[PDB]
Coordinates of C-alpha atoms and ligand atoms in Angstrom, one line a residue:
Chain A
X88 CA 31.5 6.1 11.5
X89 CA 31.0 2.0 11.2
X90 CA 29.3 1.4 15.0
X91 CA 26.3 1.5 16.6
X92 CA 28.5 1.5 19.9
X93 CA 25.8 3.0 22.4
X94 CA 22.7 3.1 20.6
X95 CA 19.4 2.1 21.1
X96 CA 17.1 -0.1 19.0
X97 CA 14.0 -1.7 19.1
X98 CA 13.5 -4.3 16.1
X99 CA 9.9 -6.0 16.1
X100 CA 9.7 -9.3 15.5
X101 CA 13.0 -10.5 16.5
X102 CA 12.6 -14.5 17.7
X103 CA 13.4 -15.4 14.5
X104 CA 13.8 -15.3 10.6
X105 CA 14.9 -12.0 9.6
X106 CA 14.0 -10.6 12.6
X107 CA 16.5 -12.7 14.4
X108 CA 19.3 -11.9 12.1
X109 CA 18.9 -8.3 12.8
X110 CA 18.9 -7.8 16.3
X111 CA 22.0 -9.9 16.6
X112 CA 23.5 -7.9 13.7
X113 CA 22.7 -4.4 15.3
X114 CA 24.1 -6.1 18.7
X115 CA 26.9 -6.8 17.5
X116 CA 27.9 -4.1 16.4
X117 CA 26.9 -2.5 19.6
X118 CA 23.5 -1.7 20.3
X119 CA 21.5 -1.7 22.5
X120 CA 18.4 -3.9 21.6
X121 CA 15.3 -4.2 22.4
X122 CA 12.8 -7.1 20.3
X123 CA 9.2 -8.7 20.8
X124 CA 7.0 -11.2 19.2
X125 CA 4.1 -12.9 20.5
X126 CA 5.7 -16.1 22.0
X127 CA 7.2 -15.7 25.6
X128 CA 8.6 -19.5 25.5
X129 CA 10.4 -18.1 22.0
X130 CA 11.0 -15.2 23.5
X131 CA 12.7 -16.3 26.2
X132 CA 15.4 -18.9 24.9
X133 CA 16.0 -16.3 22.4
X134 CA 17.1 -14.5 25.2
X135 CA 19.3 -16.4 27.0
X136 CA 20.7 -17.5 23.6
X137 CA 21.9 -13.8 23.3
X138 CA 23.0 -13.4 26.9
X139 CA 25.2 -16.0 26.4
X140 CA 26.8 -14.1 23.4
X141 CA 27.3 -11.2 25.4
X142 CA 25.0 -9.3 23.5
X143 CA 23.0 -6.6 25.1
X144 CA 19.0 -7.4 24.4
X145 CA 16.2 -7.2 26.2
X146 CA 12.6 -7.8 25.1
X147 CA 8.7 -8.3 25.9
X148 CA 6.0 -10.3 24.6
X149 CA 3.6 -8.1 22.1
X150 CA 1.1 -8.7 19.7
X151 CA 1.3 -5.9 17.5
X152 CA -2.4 -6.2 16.0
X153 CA -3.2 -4.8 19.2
X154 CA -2.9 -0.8 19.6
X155 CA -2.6 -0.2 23.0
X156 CA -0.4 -3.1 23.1
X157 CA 2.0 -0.8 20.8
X158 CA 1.4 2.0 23.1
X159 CA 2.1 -0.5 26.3
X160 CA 5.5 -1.6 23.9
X161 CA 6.6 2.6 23.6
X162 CA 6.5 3.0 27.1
X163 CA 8.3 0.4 28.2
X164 CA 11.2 0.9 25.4
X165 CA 10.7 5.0 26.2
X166 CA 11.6 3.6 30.6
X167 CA 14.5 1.4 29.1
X168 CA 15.9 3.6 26.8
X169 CA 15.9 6.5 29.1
X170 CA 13.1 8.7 26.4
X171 CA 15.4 8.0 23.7
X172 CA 15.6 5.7 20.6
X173 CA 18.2 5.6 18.2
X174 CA 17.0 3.1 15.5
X175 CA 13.5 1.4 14.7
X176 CA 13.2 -1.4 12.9
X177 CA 9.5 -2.4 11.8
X178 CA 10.6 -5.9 10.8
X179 CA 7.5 -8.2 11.9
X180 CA 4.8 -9.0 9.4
X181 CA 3.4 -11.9 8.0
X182 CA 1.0 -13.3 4.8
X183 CA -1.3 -15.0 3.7
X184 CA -1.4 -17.5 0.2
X185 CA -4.9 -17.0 -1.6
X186 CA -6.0 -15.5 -5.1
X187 CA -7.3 -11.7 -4.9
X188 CA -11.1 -12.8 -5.2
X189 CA -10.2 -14.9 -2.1
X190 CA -9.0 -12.9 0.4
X191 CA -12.0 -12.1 3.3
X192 CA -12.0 -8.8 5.6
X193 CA -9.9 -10.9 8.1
X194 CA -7.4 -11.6 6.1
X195 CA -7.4 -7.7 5.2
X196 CA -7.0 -7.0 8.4
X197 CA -4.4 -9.4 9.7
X198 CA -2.3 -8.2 7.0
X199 CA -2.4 -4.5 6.4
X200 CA -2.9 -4.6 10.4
X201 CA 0.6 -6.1 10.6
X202 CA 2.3 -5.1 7.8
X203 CA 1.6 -1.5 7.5
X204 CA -0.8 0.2 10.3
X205 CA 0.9 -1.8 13.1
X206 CA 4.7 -0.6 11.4
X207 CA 3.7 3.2 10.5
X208 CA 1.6 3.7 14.5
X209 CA 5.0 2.7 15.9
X210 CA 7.0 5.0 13.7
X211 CA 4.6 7.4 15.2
X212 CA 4.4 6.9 19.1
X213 CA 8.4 6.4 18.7
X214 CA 8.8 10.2 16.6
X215 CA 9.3 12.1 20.2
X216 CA 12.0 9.3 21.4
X217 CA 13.9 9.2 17.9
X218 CA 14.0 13.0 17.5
X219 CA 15.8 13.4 21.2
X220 CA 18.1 11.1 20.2
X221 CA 19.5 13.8 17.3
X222 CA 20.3 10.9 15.2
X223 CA 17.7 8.4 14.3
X224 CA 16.3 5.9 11.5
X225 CA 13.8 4.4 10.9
X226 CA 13.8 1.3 8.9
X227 CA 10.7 -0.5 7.3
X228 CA 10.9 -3.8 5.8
X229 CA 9.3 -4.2 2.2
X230 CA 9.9 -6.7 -0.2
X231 CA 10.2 -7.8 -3.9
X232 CA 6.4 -8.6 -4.0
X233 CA 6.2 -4.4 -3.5
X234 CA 7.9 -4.1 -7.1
X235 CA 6.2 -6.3 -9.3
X236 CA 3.4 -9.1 -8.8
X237 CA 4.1 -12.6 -7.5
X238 CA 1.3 -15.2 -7.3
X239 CA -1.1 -16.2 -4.2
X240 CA -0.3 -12.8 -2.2
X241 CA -1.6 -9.3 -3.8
X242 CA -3.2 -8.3 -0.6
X243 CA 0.7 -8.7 0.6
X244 CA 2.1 -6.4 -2.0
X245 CA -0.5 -3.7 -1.6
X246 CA 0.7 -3.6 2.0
X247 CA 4.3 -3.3 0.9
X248 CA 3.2 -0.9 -1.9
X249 CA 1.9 1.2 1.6
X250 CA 5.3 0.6 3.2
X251 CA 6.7 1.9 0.2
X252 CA 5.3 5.0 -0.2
X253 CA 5.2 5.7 3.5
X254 CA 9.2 5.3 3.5
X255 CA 9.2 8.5 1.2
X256 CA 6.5 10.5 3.0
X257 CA 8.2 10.2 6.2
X258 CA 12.2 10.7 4.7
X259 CA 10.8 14.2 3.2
X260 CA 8.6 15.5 6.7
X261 CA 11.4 14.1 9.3
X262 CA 14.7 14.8 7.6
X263 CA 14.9 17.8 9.7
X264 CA 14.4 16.4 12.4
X265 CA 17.7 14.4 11.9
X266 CA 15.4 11.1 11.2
X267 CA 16.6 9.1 8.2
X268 CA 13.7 6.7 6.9
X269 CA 14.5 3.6 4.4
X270 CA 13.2 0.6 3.7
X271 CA 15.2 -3.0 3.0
X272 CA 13.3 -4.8 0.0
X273 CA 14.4 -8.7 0.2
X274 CA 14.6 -11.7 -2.2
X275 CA 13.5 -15.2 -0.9
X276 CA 15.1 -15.7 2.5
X277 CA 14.4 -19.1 3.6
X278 CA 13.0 -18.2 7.2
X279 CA 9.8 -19.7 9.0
X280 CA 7.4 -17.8 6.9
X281 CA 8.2 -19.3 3.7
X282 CA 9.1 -22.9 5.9
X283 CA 5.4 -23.0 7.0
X284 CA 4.3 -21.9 3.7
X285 CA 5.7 -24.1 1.7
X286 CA 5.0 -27.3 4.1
X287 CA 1.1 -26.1 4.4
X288 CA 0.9 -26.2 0.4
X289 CA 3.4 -27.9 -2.5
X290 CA 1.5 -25.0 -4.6
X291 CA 3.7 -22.3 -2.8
X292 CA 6.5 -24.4 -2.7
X293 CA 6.5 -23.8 -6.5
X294 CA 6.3 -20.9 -6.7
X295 CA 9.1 -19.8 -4.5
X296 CA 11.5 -22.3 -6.5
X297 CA 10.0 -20.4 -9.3
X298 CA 11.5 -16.9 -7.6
X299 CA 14.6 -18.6 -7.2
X300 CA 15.1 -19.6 -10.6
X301 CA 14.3 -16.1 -11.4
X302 CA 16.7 -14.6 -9.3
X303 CA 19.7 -14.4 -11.3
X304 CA 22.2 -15.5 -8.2
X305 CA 20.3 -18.8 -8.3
X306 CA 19.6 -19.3 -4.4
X307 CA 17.7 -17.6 -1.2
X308 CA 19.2 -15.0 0.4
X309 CA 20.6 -15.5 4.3
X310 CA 19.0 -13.2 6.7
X311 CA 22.1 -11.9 7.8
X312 CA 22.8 -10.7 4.2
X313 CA 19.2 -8.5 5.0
X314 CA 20.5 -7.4 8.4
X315 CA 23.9 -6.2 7.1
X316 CA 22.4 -3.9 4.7
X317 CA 20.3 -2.9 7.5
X318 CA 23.3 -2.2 9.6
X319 CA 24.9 -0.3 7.7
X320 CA 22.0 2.0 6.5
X321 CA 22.3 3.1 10.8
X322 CA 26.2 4.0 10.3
X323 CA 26.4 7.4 10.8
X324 CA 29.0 6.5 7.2
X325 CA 25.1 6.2 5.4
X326 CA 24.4 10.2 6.8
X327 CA 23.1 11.2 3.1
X328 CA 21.0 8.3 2.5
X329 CA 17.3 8.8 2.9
X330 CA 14.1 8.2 1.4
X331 CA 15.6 5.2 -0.6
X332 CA 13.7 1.6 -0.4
X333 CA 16.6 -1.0 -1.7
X334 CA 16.5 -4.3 -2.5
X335 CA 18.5 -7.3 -1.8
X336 CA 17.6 -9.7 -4.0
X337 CA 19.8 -11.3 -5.9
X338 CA 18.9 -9.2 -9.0
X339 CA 15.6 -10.8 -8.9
X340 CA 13.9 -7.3 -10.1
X341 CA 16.7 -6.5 -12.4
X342 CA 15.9 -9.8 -14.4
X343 CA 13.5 -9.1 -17.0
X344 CA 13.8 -11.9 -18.9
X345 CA 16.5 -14.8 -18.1
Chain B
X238 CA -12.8 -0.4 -32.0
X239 CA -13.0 3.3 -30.6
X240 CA -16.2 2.9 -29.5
X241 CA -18.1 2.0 -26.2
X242 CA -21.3 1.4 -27.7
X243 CA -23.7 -1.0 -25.7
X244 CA -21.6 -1.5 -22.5
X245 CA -21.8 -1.6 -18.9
X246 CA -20.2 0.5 -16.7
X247 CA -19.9 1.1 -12.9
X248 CA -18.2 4.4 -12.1
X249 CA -18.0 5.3 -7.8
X250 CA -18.5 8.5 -6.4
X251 CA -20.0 9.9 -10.1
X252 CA -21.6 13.0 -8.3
X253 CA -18.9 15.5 -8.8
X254 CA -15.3 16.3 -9.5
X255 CA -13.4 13.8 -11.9
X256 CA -16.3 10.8 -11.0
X257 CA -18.9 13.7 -12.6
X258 CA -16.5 14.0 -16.1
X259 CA -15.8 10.2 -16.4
X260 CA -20.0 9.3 -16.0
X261 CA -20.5 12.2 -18.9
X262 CA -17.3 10.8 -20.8
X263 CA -18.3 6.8 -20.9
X264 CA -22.1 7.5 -21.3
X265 CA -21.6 10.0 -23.7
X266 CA -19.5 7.2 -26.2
X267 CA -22.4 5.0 -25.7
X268 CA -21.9 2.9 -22.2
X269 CA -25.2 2.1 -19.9
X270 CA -23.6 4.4 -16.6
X271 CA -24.6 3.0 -13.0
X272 CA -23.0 5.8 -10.2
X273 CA -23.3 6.3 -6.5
X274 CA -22.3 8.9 -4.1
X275 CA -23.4 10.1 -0.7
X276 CA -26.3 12.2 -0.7
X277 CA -29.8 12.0 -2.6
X278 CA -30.6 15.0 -3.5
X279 CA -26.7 15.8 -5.3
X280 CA -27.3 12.6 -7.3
X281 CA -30.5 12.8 -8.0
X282 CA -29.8 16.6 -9.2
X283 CA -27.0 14.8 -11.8
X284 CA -29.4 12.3 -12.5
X285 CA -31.4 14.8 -13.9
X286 CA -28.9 16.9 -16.0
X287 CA -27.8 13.9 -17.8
X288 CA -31.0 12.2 -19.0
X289 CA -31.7 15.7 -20.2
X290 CA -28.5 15.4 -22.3
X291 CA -29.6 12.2 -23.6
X292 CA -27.2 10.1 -21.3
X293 CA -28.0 6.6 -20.3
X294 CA -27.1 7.2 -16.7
X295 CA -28.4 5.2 -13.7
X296 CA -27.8 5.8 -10.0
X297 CA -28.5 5.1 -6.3
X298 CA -27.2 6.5 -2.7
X299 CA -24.2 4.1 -1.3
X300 CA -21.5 4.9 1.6
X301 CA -18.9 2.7 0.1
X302 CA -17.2 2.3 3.7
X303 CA -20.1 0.2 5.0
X304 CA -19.3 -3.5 3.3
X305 CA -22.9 -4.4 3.5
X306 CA -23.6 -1.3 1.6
X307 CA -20.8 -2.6 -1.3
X308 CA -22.2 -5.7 -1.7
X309 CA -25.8 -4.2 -2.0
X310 CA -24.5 -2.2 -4.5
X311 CA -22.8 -5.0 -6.3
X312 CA -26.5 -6.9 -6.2
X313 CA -28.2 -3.7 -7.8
X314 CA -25.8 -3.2 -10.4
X315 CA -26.2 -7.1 -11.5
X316 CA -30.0 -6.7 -12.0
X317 CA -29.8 -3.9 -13.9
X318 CA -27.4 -5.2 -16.2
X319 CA -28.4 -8.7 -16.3
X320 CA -25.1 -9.8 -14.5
X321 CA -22.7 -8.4 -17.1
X322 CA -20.0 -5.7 -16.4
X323 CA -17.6 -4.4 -18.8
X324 CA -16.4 -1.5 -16.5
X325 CA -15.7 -0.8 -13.2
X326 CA -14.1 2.8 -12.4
X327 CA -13.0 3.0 -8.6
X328 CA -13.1 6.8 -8.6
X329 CA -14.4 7.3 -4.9
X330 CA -11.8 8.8 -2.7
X331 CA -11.0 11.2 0.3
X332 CA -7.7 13.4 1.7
X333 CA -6.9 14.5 5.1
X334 CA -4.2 17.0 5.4
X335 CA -2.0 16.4 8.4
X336 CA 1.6 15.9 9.7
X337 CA 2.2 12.1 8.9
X338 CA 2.4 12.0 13.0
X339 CA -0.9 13.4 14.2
X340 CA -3.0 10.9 11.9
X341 CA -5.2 9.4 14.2
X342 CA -6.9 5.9 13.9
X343 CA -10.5 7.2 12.5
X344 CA -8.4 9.3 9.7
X345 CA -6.5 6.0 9.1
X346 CA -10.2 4.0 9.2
X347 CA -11.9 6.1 6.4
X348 CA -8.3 7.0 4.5
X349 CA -7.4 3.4 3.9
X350 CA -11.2 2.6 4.2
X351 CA -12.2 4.5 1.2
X352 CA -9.1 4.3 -1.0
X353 CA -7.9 0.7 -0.9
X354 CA -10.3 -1.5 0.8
X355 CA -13.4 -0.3 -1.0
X356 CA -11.8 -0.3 -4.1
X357 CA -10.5 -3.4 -3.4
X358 CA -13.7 -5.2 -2.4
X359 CA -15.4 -4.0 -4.8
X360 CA -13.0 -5.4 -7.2
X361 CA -13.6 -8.4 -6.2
X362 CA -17.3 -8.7 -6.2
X363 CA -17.5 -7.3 -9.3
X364 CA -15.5 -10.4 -11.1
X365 CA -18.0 -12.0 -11.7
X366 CA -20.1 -9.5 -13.5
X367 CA -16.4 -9.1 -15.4
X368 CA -15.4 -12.4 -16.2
X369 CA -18.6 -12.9 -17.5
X370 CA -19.2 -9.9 -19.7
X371 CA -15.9 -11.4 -21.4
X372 CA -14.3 -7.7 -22.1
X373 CA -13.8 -6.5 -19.0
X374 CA -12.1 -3.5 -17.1
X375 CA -11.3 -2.0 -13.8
X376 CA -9.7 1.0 -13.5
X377 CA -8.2 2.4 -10.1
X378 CA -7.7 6.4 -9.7
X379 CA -4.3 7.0 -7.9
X380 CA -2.5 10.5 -8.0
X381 CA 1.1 12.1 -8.6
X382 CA 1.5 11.3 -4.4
X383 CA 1.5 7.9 -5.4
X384 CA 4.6 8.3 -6.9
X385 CA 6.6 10.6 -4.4
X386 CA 6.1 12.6 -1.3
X387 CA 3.7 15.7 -1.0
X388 CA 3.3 17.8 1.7
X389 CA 0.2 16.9 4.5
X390 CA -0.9 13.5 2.8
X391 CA 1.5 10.9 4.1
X392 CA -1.4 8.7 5.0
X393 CA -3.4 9.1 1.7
X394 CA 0.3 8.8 0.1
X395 CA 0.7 5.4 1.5
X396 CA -3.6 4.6 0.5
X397 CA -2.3 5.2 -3.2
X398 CA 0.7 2.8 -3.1
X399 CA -1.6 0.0 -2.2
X400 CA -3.5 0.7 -5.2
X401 CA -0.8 0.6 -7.9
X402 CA 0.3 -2.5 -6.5
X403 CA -3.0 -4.1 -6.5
X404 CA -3.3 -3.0 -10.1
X405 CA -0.6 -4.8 -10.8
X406 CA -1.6 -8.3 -9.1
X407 CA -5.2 -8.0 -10.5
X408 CA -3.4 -7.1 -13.8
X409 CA -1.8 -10.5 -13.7
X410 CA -4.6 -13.1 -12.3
X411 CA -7.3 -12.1 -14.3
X412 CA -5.5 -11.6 -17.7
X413 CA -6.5 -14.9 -18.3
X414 CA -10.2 -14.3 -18.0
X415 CA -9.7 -11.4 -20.2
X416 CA -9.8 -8.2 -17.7
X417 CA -7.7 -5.9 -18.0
X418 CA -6.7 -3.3 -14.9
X419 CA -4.7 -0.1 -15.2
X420 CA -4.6 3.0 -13.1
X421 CA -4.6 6.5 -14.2
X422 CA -3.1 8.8 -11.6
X423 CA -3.8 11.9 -12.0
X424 CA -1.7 15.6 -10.7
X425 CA -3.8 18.5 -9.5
X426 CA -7.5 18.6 -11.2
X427 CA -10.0 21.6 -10.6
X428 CA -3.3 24.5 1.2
X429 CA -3.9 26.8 -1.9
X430 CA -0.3 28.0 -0.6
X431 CA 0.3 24.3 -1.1
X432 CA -1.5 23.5 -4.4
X433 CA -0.2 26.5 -6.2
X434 CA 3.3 25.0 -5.4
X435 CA 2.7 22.1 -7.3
X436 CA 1.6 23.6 -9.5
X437 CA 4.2 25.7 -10.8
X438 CA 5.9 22.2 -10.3
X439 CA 4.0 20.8 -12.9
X440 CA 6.0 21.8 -16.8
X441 CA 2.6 23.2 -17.8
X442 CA 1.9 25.6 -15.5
X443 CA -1.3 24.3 -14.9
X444 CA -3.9 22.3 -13.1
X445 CA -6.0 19.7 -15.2
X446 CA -9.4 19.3 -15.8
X447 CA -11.4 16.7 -15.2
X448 CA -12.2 15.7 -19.1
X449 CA -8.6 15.5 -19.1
X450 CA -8.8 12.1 -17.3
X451 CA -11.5 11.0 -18.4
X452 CA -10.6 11.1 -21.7
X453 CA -7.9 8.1 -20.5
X454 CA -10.0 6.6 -19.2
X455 CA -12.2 6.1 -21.9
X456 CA -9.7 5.3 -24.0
X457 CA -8.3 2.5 -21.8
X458 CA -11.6 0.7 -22.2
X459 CA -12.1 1.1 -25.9
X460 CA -11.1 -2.6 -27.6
X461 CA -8.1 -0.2 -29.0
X462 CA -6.4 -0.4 -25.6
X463 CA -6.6 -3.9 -26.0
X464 CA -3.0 -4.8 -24.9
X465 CA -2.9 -2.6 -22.5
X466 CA -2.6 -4.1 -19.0
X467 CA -0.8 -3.4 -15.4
X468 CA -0.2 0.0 -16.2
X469 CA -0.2 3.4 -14.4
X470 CA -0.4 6.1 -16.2
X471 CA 0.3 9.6 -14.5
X472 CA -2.2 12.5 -16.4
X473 CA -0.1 15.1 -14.5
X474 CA 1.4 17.9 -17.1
X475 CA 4.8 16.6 -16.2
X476 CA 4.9 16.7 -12.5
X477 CA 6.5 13.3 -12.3
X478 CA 8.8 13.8 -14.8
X479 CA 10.4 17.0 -13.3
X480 CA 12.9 16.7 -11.1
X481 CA 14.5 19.7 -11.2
X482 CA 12.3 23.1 -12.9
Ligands
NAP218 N1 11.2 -14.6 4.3 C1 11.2 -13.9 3.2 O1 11.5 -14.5 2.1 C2 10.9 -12.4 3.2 C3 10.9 -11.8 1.9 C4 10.6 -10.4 1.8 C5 10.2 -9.7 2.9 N2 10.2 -10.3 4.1 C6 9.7 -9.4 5.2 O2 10.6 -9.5 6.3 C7 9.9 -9.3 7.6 C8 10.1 -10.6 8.4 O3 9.9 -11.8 7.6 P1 10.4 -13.2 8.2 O4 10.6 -14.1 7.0 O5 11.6 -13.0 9.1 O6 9.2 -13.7 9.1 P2 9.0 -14.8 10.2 O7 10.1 -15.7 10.0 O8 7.7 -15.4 10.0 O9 9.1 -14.0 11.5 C9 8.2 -12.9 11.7 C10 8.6 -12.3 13.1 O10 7.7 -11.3 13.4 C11 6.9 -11.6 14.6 N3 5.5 -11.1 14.6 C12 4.6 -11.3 13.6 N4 3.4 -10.8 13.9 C13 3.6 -10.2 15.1 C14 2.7 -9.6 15.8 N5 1.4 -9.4 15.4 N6 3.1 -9.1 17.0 C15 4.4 -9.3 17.5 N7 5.3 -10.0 16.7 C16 4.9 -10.5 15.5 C17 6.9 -13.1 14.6 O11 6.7 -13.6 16.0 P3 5.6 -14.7 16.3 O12 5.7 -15.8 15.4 O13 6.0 -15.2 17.8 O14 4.3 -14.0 16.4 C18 8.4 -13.3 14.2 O15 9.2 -13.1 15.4 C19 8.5 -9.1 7.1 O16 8.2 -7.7 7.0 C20 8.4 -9.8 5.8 O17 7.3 -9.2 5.1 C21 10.5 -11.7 4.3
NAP219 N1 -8.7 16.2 -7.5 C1 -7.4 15.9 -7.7 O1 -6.6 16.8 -7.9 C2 -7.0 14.5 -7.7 C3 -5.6 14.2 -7.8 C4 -5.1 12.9 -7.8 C5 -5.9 11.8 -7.6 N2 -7.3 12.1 -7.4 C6 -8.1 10.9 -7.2 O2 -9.3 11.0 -8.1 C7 -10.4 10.4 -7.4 C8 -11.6 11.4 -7.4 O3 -11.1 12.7 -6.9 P1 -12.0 14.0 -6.9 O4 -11.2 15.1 -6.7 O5 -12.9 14.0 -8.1 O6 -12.9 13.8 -5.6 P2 -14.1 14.6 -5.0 O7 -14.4 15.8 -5.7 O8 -13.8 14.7 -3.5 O9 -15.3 13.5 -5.2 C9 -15.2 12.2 -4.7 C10 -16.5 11.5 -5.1 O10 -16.5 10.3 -4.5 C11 -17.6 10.2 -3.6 N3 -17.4 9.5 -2.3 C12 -16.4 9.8 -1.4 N4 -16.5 8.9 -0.4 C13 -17.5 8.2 -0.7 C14 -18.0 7.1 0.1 N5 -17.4 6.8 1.3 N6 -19.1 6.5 -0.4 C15 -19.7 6.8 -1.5 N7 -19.2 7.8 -2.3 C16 -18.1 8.5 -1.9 C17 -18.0 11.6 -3.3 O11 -19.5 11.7 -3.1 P3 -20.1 12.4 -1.8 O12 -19.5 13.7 -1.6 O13 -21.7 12.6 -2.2 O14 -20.0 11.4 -0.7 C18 -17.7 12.3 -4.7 O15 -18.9 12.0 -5.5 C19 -10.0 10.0 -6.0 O16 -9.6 8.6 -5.9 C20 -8.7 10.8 -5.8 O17 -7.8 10.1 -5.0 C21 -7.8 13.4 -7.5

């Protein structure tokens, strides 16, 4: 009722930030794990790092902009896995800081390519494995830039506003098929994606000690604060729980005001 | 104040349905009209009706999934009206009806293609025009399945979401250079199986009409609405409101 003992995962995007945080968190608990990101070196000590934990993970290197890459990814997880996934966790994604007039057809593409085509394909290809497993989820990883506007990334939110609505439409048609589908919304986490941001430009290191000022709590979130919700959303304890996207913010989206 | 006397207006996909209503709706309180669809002969056939009616309505054929055909578009439209827009209504849009699992990549291409990315672009291209015109508007058309799941349109669902956050961004970076951007999301305007379940869904027992919409629309851009910003506004008969009937 609270372990994953002896199920299968695949979280995208797991050599570090959130990503990282989740696949030792499902681990843990006692999945099985499989992750990928685009970096074999990364990859690799990543690897090691979690063999040495005794943590059961295994992994490949994947660019997700690619689609037959995802379909190359879906076999190999299907061989592994024995045709059968438990949880999927569409964490990778990245962004891009411009204004909306800014943002070229690249940029569009990176982005929604990442963030939502790259996240929903997978949810597709991995339908089959997740509905012979009897009990699957499928987690998707929005944020609080899909509530309300933040500066320098509205080609972000409209990606998470996908996400977003996606989480519902798939909750409603797989339910059925004993498939619960969520998504985890977070706050600032202080992860490589903000890190690089904020080192590239002092403008976007304002304004994410602008969001933390905002968020009621006063401080960034930890990933493993994102992966435990995430966790526990795959307890077979969270069986009524579908459709929902929840965020861990800090009460960022409650504030209003303060 | 209630009035749209002397201004500009770009409305997509004018040619029929709810584009048709809004072109008749915004030309008929007084706004210059430039519209676009697909096909010569269907907009050259509405062309006709409404400079018969006394409508100031201009047009020309545009497949808003080409992006050299967008910014074409955009180039036309700021001749015409000597660089000055006070109105742009992204009304052009498309469904496909499937199981959120047999979408395929072309459905994705010209889903996501014509709802967000054309309506997006062309957003952008047209601030200029906008910002200049120093009263400007752009108004997105989303739908009741941007708000919560429907049956076969998981992928258009998901199209619609983008949208109502964009409005929401745009909303906020270009309040300064006085635009305002709002989306009016409409439930089922004039699968029947399907649509006559949401119907009896919907408090009023029935579907819309185009003038229905329109009539927000227009509204939205009269100097009236003038605090009005970042807003969706669901012209649905109650659908979203009703959990339970
Ligand atoms: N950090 C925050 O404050 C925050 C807030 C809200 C939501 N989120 C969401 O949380 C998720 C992860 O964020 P994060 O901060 O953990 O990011 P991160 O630190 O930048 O890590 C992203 C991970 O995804 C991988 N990845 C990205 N693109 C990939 C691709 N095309 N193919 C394969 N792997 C790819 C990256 O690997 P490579 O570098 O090797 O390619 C990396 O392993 C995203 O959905 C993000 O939108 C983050
Ligand atoms: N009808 C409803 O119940 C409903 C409900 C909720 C939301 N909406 C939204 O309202 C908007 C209009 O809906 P509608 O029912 O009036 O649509 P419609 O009857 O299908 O008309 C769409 C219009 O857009 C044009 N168009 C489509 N693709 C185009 C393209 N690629 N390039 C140029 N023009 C294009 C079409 O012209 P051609 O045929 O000549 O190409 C047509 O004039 C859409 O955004 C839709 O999402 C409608």
């Amino acid at each position: 009722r609270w372990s994953l003992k002896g199920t299968t995962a695949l979280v995208t995007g797991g050599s570090k930030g959130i990503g990282y945080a989740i696949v030792e968190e499902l681990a843990g608990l006692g999945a099985r794990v499989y992750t990928c990101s685009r970096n074999e070196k990364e990859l690799d000590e990543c690897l090691e790092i979690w063999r040495e934990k005794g943590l059961n993970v295994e992994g490949s290197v994947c660019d997700l902009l690619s689609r037959t890459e995802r379909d190359k990814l879906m076999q190999t997880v299907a061989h592994v896995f024995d045709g059968k996934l438990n949880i999927l966790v569409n964490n990778a994604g990245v962004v891009i800081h411009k204004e909306a007039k800014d943002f070229t057809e690249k940029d569009y593409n990176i982005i929604m390519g990442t963030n939502f085509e790259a996240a929903y394909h997978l949810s597709q290809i991995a339908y089959p494995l997740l509905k012979a497993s009897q009990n699957g989820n499928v987690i998707f990883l929005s944020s609080i830039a899909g509530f309300s506007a933040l500066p320098s990334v509205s080609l972000y939110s409209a990606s998470k506003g996908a996400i977003n609505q996606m989480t519902k439409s798939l909750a409603c048609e797989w339910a059925k098929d004993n498939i619960r589908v969520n998504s985890v919304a977070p706050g600032v986490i202080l992860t490589p994606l903000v890190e690089t941001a904020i080192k590239k430009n002092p403008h976007q290191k304002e304004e994410i000690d602008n969001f933390i000022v905002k968020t009621p709590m006063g401080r960034a979130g930890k990933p493993q604060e994102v992966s435990a919700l995430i966790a526990f959303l795959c307890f077979p304890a969270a069986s009524y729980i579908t459709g929902q996207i929840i965020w861990a913010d800090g009460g960022f989206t409650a504030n209003g005001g303060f």
